[PDB]
Amino acid sequence: RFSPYAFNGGTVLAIAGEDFSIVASDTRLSEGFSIHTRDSPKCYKLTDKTVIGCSGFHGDCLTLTKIIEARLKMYKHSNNKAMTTGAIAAMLSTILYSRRFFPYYVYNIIGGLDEEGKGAVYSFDPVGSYQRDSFKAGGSASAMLQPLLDNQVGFKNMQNVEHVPLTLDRAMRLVKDVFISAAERDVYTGDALRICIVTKEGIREETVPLRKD
Amino acid sequence: TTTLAFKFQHGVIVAVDSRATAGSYISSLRMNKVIEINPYLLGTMSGCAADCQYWERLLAKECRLYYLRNGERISVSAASKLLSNMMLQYRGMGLSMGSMICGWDKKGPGLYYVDDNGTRLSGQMFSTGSGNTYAYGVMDSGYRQDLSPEEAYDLGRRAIAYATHRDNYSGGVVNMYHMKEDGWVKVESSDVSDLLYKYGE
Amino acid sequence: TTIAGLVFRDGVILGADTRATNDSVVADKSCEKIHFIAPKIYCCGAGVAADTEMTTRMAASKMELHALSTGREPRVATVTRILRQTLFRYQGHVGASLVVGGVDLNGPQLYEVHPHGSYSRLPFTALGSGQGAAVALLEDRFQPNMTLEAAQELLVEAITAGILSDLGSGGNVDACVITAGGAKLQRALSTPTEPVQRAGRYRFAPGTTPVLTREVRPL
Amino acid sequence: TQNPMVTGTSVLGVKFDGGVVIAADMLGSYGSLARFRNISRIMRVNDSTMLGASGDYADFQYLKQVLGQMVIDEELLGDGHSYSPRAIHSWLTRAMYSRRSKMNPLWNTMVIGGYADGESFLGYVDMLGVAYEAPSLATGYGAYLAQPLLREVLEKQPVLSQTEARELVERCMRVLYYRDARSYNRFQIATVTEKGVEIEGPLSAQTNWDIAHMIS
Amino acid sequence: TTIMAVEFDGGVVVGSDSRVSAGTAVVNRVFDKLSPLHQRIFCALSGSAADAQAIADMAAYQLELHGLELEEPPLVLAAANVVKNISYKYREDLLAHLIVAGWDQREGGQVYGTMGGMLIRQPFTIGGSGSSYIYGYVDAAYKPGMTPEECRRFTTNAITLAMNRDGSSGGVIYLVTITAAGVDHRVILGDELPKFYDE
Amino acid sequence: TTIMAVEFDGGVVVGSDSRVSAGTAVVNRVFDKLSPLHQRIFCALSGSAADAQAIADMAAYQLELHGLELEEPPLVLAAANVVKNISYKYREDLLAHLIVAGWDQREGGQVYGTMGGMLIRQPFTIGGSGSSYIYGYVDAAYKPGMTPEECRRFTTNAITLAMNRDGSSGGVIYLVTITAAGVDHRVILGDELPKFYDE
Amino acid sequence: MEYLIGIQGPDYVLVASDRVAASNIVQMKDDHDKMFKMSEKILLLCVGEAGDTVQFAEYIQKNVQLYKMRNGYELSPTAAANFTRRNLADCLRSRTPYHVNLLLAGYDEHEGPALYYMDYLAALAKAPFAAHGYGAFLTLSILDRYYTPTISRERAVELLRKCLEELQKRFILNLPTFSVRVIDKDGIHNLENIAF
Amino acid sequence: MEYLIGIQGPDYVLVASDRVAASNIVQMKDDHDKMFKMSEKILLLCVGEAGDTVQFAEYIQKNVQLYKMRNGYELSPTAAANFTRRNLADCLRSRTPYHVNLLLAGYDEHEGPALYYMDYLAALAKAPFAAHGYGAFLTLSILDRYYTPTISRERAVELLRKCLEELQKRFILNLPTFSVRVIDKDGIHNLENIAF
Amino acid sequence: SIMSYNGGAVMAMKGKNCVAIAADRRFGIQAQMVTTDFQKIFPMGDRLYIGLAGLATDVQTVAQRLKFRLNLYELKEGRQIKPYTLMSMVANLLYEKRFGPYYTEPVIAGLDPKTFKPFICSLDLIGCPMVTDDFVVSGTCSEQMYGMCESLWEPNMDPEHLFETISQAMLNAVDRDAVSGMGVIVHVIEKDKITTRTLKARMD
Ligand SMILES: *[C@@](C)(CO)[C@](*)(O)[C@H](Cc1ccccc1)NC(=O)[C@H](Cc1ccc(OC)cc1)NC(=O)[C@H](C)NC(=O)CN1CCOCC1
Ligand SMILES: *[C@@](C)(CO)[C@](*)(O)[C@H](Cc1ccccc1)NC(=O)[C@H](Cc1ccc(OC)cc1)NC(=O)[C@H](C)NC(=O)CN1CCOCC1
Ligand SMILES: *[C@@](C)(CO)[C@](*)(O)[C@H](Cc1ccccc1)NC(=O)[C@H](Cc1ccc(OC)cc1)NC(=O)[C@H](C)NC(=O)CN1CCOCC1
Ligand SMILES: *[C@@](C)(CO)[C@](*)(O)[C@H](Cc1ccccc1)NC(=O)[C@H](Cc1ccc(OC)cc1)NC(=O)[C@H](C)NC(=O)CN1CCOCC1
Ligand SMILES: [Cl-]
Ligand SMILES: [Cl-]
Ligand SMILES: [Cl-]
Ligand SMILES: [Cl-]
Ligand SMILES: [Cl-]
Ligand SMILES: [Cl-]
Ligand SMILES: [Cl-]
Numbered sequence A: 001r002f003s004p005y006a007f008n009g010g011t012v013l014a015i016a017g018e019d020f021s022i023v024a025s026d027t028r029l030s031e032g033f034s035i036h037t038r039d040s041p042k043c044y045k046l047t048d049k050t051v052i053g054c055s056g057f058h059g060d061c062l063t064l065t066k067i068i069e070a071r072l073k074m075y076k077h078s079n080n081k082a083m084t085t086g087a088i089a090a091m092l093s094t095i096l097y098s099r100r101f102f103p104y105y106v107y108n109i110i111g112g113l114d115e116e117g118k119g120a121v122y123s124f125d126p127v128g129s130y131q132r133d134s135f136k137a138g139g140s141a142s143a144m145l146q147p148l149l150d151n152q153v154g155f156k157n158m159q160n161v162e163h164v165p166l167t168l169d170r171a172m173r174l175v176k177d178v179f180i181s182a183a184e185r186d187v188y189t190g191d192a193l194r195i196c197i198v199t200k201e202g203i204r205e206e207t208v209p210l211r212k213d
Numbered sequence B: 001t002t003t004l005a006f007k008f009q010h011g012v013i014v015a016v017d018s019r020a021t022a023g024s025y026i027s028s029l030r031m032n033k034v035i036e037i038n039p040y041l042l043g044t045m046s047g048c049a050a051d052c053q054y055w056e057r058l059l060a061k062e063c064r065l066y067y068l069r070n071g072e073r074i075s076v077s078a079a080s081k082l083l084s085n086m087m088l089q090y091r092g093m094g095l096s097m098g099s100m101i102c103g104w105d106k107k108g109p110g111l112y113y114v115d116d117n118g119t120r121l122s123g124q125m126f127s128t129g130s131g132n133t134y135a136y137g138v139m140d141s142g143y144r145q146d147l148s149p150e151e152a153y154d155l156g157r158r159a160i161a162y163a164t165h166r167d168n169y170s171g172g173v174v175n176m177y178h179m180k181e182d183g184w185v186k187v188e189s190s191d192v193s194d195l196l197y198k199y200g201e
Numbered sequence C: 001t002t003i004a005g006l007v008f009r010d011g012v013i014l015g016a017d018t019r020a021t022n023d024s025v026v027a028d029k030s031c032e033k034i035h036f037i038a039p040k041i042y043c044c045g046a047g048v049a050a051d052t053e054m055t056t057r058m059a060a061s062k063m064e065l066h067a068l069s070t071g072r073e074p075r076v077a078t079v080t081r082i083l084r085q086t087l088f089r090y091q092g093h094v095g096a097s098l099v100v101g102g103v104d105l106n107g108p109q110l111y112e113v114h115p116h117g118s119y120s121r122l123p124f125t126a127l128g129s130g131q132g133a134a135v136a137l138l139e140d141r142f143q144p145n146m147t148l149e150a151a152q153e154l155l156v157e158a159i160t161a162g163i164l165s166d167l168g169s170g171g172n173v174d175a176c177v178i179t180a181g182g183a184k185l186q187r188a189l190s191t192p193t194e195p196v197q198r199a200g201r202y203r204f205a206p207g208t209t210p211v212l213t214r215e216v217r218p219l
Numbered sequence D: 001t002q003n004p005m006v007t008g009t010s011v012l013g014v015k016f017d018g019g020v021v022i023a024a025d026m027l028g029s030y031g032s033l034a035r036f037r038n039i040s041r042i043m044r045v046n047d048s049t050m051l052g053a054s055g056d057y058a059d060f061q062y063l064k065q066v067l068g069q070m071v072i073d074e075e076l077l078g079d080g081h082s083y084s085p086r087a088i089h090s091w092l093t094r095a096m097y098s099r100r101s102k103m104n105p106l107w108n109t110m111v112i113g114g115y116a117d118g119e120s121f122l123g124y125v126d127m128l129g130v131a132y133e134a135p136s137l138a139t140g141y142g143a144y145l146a147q148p149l150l151r152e153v154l155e156k157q158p159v160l161s162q163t164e165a166r167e168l169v170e171r172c173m174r175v176l177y178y179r180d181a182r183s184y185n186r187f188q189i190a191t192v193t194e195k196g197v198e199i200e201g202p203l204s205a206q207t208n209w210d211i212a213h214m215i216s
Numbered sequence E, F: 001t002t003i004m005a006v007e008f009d010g011g012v013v014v015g016s017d018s019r020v021s022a023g024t025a026v027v028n029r030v031f032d033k034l035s036p037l038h039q040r041i042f043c044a045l046s047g048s049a050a051d052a053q054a055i056a057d058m059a060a061y062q063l064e065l066h067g068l069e070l071e072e073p074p075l076v077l078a079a080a081n082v083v084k085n086i087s088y089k090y091r092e093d094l095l096a097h098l099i100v101a102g103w104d105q106r107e108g109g110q111v112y113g114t115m116g117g118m119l120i121r122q123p124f125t126i127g128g129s130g131s132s133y134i135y136g137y138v139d140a141a142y143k144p145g146m147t148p149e150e151c152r153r154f155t156t157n158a159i160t161l162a163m164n165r166d167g168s169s170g171g172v173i174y175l176v177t178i179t180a181a182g183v184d185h186r187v188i189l190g191d192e193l194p195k196f197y198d199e
Numbered sequence G, H: 001m002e003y004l005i006g007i008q009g010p011d012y013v014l015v016a017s018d019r020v021a022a023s024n025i026v027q028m029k030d031d032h033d034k035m036f037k038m039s040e041k042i043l044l045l046c047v048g049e050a051g052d053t054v055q056f057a058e059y060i061q062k063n064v065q066l067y068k069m070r071n072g073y074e075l076s077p078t079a080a081a082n083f084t085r086r087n088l089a090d091c092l093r094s095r096t097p098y099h100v101n102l103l104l105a106g107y108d109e110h111e112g113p114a115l116y117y118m119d120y121l122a123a124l125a126k127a128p129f130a131a132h133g134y135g136a137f138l139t140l141s142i143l144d145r146y147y148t149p150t151i152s153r154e155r156a157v158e159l160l161r162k163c164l165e166e167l168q169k170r171f172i173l174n175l176p177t178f179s180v181r182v183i184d185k186d187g188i189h190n191l192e193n194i195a196f
Numbered sequence I: 001s002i003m004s005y006n007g008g009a010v011m012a013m014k015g016k017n018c019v020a021i022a023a024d025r026r027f028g029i030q031a032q033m034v035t036t037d038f039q040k041i042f043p044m045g046d047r048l049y050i051g052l053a054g055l056a057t058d059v060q061t062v063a064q065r066l067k068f069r070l071n072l073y074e075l076k077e078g079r080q081i082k083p084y085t086l087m088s089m090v091a092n093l094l095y096e097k098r099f100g101p102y103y104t105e106p107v108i109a110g111l112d113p114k115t116f117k118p119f120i121c122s123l124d125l126i127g128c129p130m131v132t133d134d135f136v137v138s139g140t141c142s143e144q145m146y147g148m149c150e151s152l153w154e155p156n157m158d159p160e161h162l163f164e165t166i167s168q169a170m171l172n173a174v175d176r177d178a179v180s181g182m183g184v185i186v187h188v189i190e191k192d193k194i195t196t197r198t199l200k201a202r203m204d
């Protein structure tokens, strides 16, 4: 027959702090046992306050990002303001569900700030079930990224650690570390790591090289 | 999921787990499975996550319109019936949703179970999810109409916690509500495994 | 896997990566794929890991036993025919794609043998999921009667190409040069990727893990 | 299209200093059979962007006419505006995904080469809507054979002269002919530059069959 | 594959393409599909590579023993018969056609087809996937009583025309000529292939 | 089917076999597969009989209207384009290749292939199930600048060779020659078919 | 899997339905009612697919009610049964069909007590007695054995008792409680539920 | 679909099994016994495929008996359980496998009361308490709730009562009678069958 | 999946003159858990252990059949088994069932008798041996365990620190797998002693 889907890899990670949000991904686009390109970052600026990360079928991720872009403009002409992080996350849920019977093979994670300036992260499934959380990973290597974050950020399975609040510095290294680990095991993760930091000042991008095999 | 709700002399209590599973993998362990529609309506969630979220929010959307139109708030019977009808429009299309509707109208305390099939029944007790059979066992062994708020909190807590011990797909925390004459009040968000150790003396 | 073979003026050279995959996760980063058969006959295995392991060990076991009984330098053509008749009997269910290379009284020889039992003799070849990358490099730069060093570099480039372009390939490029004089198994000849260094320490002070039961057995 | 009839194999792309060069062989296969050994799989969209296409040829000829008319329509207005290589790439991406989403795909893989504003363009388009940009491009079996070659050279030498790109392309067509059973030894080279699009006539890559005597 | 054999007075001519394929990929662009069964009996290989080669070995094995037991070079008829028997006994399990051609003292130069387990002698025979595209050519271009050189051109022309049309055929043309005097093995390279209409 | 068209100076030649088949049975042993689309544009039919004929009718319909609206005999390019468009619009639902050949004042004698919905002009073109068996022959037997009589022989020879080999081809050879002066329709009967190697 | 049963006498109709609301392996309800009031003297007992039964039963229920409002009088048990038959039969050769097995009991002021049996295929049959569900296989013989068309209500409840006791003894499924109601000249009378 | 349950105490093992012999929709028997006597202090409770259970159970039964005759002493509850585990596991990757789910209760003079649970896949696990059949899903939680390893026989029968009452109330299938037996120092004692 | 039926997690780690092996304590059938104290690590000698993840029957069967062959080895040979030899013995045992394999992926962790050297390995379900200098993982949560070990493991860990690292790696990887858990058991192997611990793992 004919399959409307392809698997292109990519893992996306988001973490929430007091006044910052982090969205990070690998730069590898692949298909089968071949790499399409080594220069495909999954982070995308939507507003100064909100950044998206899409992974899975790149055809769906591209069209979906363009839908969101158009929908962002539609909102602002109609409402006279920018669509907030929580509003974008709510809108994304509905867009994904309108395709409940022909879904976007897509893993979306939303990172930004809420109306109080506090860090916000939204994790989605291919069909639009979502919630807010402190940290979440989506994509081919999400199961590799999750447990380490559960232990270190959530302080899970530990007895007398004093429970230190999350700092930008510490989260940055944490983001770097989990991807370094995943690139060693997941064949779909590698090349380079791009981190997008959302703060009150705006969006700053940072690049750290990864395994290229 | 595991989900439970029962009514007694002092209203209705509602308890759910918080685990979200994709295949054999735990995607979320802090997943909210109760939707607070109005100050005195309550909806639980079980099955396909996105199906539950969307459709019970769509019920909530309509319970909002009803109050703004009629100016008198919506009954429990009406709400659960409206959801059943939404489910019936999408027949044999693969929606997976099991929900219980809780509230207080003039008829008193209202408890309802609604299926993705369209099934809708009123009763004193219900349990949905992969761990409903375990939740039922501990519920029935230790239920009486003459429960006190503290006894009922003990039972609903116990029922989820024990279900999550046996059910591969239940875990996280117990989230419990007490439906009182003047609306629900959220009782607790207690860790499941912490309780299981407490119950083990 | 990416594996490759090359004939030059003074002998043969075999190549291999060091990656093993379970599902789509890299199980081994440093597994050995160039296998010993005789002191001067070697075999590269691609496909089902355990299958390439047992077939190659079985062949080596039969080759030592053959050399013992004849008192002669094992023949690579003997290795190739033993291998293919074994694999033909299993009708391709033993997933072993092999590149066998060595030196005989009849000079340097290179064969490839597929799981179903077909064989071909040739100056250069490549097998595995990264074979496309390797043949590309070989068809591009191969010449008859190359110098060892010119032949060693091209082979490294062929395996490197496989490693970098193929998701089922990685680690170090292993080389094995076979001359009418001897065989040098240059394990980890070239190593493209490096990330062992980091700056994240995740230690736990004795007592962070909650324990319920402790038992000590004196020895 | 549910089942493609007449197909074309790998299309090549790589960008040199001051332009882009595209290669594709002049073969249209009917299954394994070489049916048409002298047909063009490349077109000049306008004077800034060019296109080589893999897969179903009827779908390529259809897309060739639709794009052909779009350029004509734009030339009629004469308002000082024309489609940039990126604009053509974006349109094509939107076209393929749209057709794919209606479960009736255009069975093509595309390479779009272009030169505009002193910058070279090279874009990939899939039949599922997969789109990206890369310094070198190879579709079908090219992605497994030619693409490794290009990357290994571009790693050692990122900037190439037009001559260097040409000889690299001819080298890749040599590999493709040797290794692809769905290929042929008649091919074209297309080039974008400051001067525009130039498609060159029937070319053959030099082959050597001396290894045919190295089996004894 | 494309394989072919032609009969002349003094002996036979056997030709083949040099390609092996797996799916759309070619894994060997220079493979000789002309395997000796005895000193003046060759066979042309087509179909499953492993299945073909296995038949070639067992055929060459039995003909060596049979040759020694009769203390005489095996008859081409005998050769064809043994290949035909293995092909028939495992017609469901072995998937390959083998053309057997050669020369003996009793009956001169002979050409045999064994596809599927049947046996037929022909003035000339073609086989393989590329044979489909040259059925018309061989019927039109054939003359009885061709000289060794003419037979050599006839096979070369027919295989060239098949390889260009067939995607599963490619590489060079391997030719062997078998006579009383011996075997002449020659290779026709890319520059040396006869030109026809190519558009 | 076997169908064929050849271009010459003054115009074109179009040939076909005369068989229609259902499974292993032939239901019509004398069918003319050369349908006129206009006065000097013909088309050669292959594939599904019902699908082919339906395309032939709609093509002839539109070309009649198009011809009247331009008050001029339709261009062969135009003819090929309309057949190509119907073939493309229903490539999954209509299963037939149609060769369109003819003559016009603008561009002389022309031959077009439309298989699957593509469009290509060729010096000559073959089609149908029997085309497989004559790819080698046409590549070898073709010369550029053939006279009307030579083109007539070329198509006859190629179709004869295909019909004998192909089980789905049989009957007689229908030939039409289209020039400026008009259309010459002739039939080549069983006794009149060119002889080749038949064993 | 549920159970319905009807026994028609000379001047009355006795009907009974089980009270289980089952899902997979659990009994969700002990006291579920499978009877629907269509008129003062018409009951519709429905059984089958989980979501389809209540939706279909209520649709018919609401239209019989609509008829009453629009005309000032109720449908005859026959007209009702034939209406519900039409609605099911029309959905049969459609994209969504209703898998419902039903039993209509009623009392007409002219014709008298009536009992109608209906397939999920929408074949309608009038019967002196009938039963739905797998239990019918075990009870129809008991009914065949002791039924006379002149059976009294006292004897009919006793006959139903004999049938329901068989479901406890031989039937694999657990159906401990049943709804029992009688239709006659005076209408529908709720009767002591039979528990085991 | 059948039910087995075992409760192991400090010095005794309580076992119970349902008494239904079901075929399609009918209960053929009210008083069928699913317990097998292997030794004076070993019971094997079997459940699953209709023909396979008794054949397999008796084969093991006859071999434990053979061991007793050949050696003058009986197998330990562990050795027995491990023997039956071997026999099932060896038929797993064969042309005919046994789809049997079993529970071995026994008393060892050294180790004490023992309760073994076994899959149809032949995975063996020692448990303080276990249950087989769909009923387990509804009863394992009750067992988890009230079980202490120091439970008395009086309290254990009461705990079994609580579990069996749940099967009447919530379980869709009709299982009204159960076999109840206790194994200890003195052997196997037949106890009052629990009827509902 | 066939391995998915029973679940389970087995992990091994290396340290300074020591090795650690860990497994979950769950025995469960798809939907439900049956036992909380199920055994997956089995001692093949003093200072040499095998952990088995996969189908519970084949976990038990392989352990019993390896013991059969091990005891015969230790009786026929005059010695206790070297770690490399056990690996090869498990490799042969599993590969013998090439076309009808045991559904378990074993982990071997121990110290070489006589020589002191730490040895860890994991294997296929058809007997492919993997030897590493750091860690090996097997089970339904391989990806989760890989993520932890890669981030947590250090080259020269003392027994005290090694136990904490292998624990934390097991605890948190199990908490993301729905078919693994109900407690974690850790064996720390030294020359002087063996330390066995059950952790306070999540019971959900
Ligand atoms: C317990 C955990 C058992 O699943 C609960 O039922 C829980 C329900 C719930 C409700 C609201 C919020 C959170 C959790 N269910 C799930 O976790 C659910 C399991 C499920 C999967 C598929 C189903 O349809 C056949 C039915 C149930 N998990 C999900 O919904 C996940 C997040 N969704 C997906 O995996 C999306 N798929 C669908 C197709 O596209 C690929 C991925
Ligand atoms: C490269 C890495 C794959 O792209 C090589 O072919 C490599 C060969 C090798 C590896 C180690 C030692 C010598 C040679 N192959 C593997 O890495 C191989 C992957 C594979 C899995 C399944 C296959 O389909 C049948 C074929 C190849 N590795 C393995 O076999 C791993 C260790 N085991 C499994 O994946 C489990 N298999 C066992 C066979 O049955 C299917 C599941
Ligand atoms: C031409 C080139 C096209 O096949 C010839 O027939 C050639 C003949 C030949 C004979 C002896 C030695 C070398 C070459 N045949 C092949 O190249 C052959 C094609 C073939 C594959 C599968 C078949 O089905 C049983 C029949 C024919 N190629 C191969 O056998 C290659 C080496 N390997 C594979 O394709 C592996 N196959 C095995 C069967 O299942 C599909 C994968
Ligand atoms: C040669 C003779 C062999 O096919 C030609 O292709 C010939 C061309 C032709 C065109 C116009 C008028 C007459 C002849 N085609 C046929 O002879 C044709 C064979 C064919 C059938 C089905 C096909 O796929 C859909 C393709 C080709 N014969 C017929 O159509 C006959 C009259 N009818 C049937 O085959 C009945 N079929 C219809 C399709 O489903 C199965 C039963
Ligand atoms: Cl900070
Ligand atoms: Cl061997
Ligand atoms: Cl063209
Ligand atoms: Cl394509
Ligand atoms: Cl569009
Ligand atoms: Cl890009
Ligand atoms: Cl012939």
Ligand SMILES: [Cl-]
Residues within 6 Å of the ligand: F027, F028, F029, F030
């Ligand atoms: Cl006729």
Ligand SMILES: [Cl-]
Residues within 6 Å of the ligand: F093, F094, F095
């Ligand atoms: Cl059709």
Ligand SMILES: [Cl-]
Residues within 6 Å of the ligand: G063, G064, G066, G067, G070
């Ligand atoms: Cl009405």
Ligand SMILES: [Cl-]
Residues within 6 Å of the ligand: G092, G093
């Ligand atoms: Cl019907």
Ligand SMILES: [Cl-]
Residues within 6 Å of the ligand: I065, I068
């Ligand atoms: Cl054994």
Ligand SMILES: [K+]
Residues within 6 Å of the ligand: A102
């Ligand atoms: K679909």
Ligand SMILES: [K+]
Residues within 6 Å of the ligand: A124, A125, A126, B022, B027
């Ligand atoms: K998910």
Ligand SMILES: [K+]
Residues within 6 Å of the ligand: A093, A094, A097, A128, B053, B054, B057
């Ligand atoms: K929503």
Ligand SMILES: [K+]
Residues within 6 Å of the ligand: D025, D173, D176, D177, D183, D184, D185, D187
């Ligand atoms: K080419």
Ligand SMILES: [K+]
Residues within 6 Å of the ligand: F163, F164, F166, F167, F168, F169, F170
């Ligand atoms: K014929």
Ligand SMILES: [K+]
Residues within 6 Å of the ligand: none
């Ligand atoms: K029907």
Ligand SMILES: [K+]
Residues within 6 Å of the ligand: H082, H083, H085, H086, I064
């Ligand atoms: K055993």
